Design a protein around this ligand. Sequence first.
Ligand SMILES: [Mn+2]
Lengths: 70, 128
Amino acid sequence: PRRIILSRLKAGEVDLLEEELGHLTTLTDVVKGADSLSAILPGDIAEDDITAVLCFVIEADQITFETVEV
Amino acid sequence: ADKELKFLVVDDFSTMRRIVRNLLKELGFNNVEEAEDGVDALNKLQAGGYGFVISDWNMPNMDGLELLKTIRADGAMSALPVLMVTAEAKKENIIAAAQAGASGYVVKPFTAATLEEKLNKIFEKLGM
Ligand SMILES: [Mn+2]
């Protein structure tokens, strides 16, 4: 599985990106920091696509993916 | 945001273009020109002077996605903000629009507020 970590988000920018992610795939382990967001994503949309759409708001440097074992 | 930014609102449904023209006027943008499809839009853009393009998705002759691609591939126009208007918030559309180089997307019908949010963010990412 994969995990997405968004950093340096503005106020409310976290919620916005959650719903944004809710259109491409389904998030599991949703953590909402005051300026961060992290969630687990299944093997759906390729990382580039997620990044392409998220860049409608944030910069690529704010997105990071990470693996996770079962 | 220069309130004299020359917008080009592309849509094959006149009424949708009228609505958009109003929403913009409400937000203070009065320089709005219309086009009925990608081909019309491209012909009008040739004259230059525009600074933003709001474009609908499906249109005869040349659809929004193609208009985006063509704009992105053209020298003088490549750096022109294009806001894609889709009718459904389906991922395939949303992803294709991002891959193509759209400055954003908004699902219709949308309010003046929604429009204004989308516009503010696009202006933000370009410091304009
Ligand atoms: Mn249409």
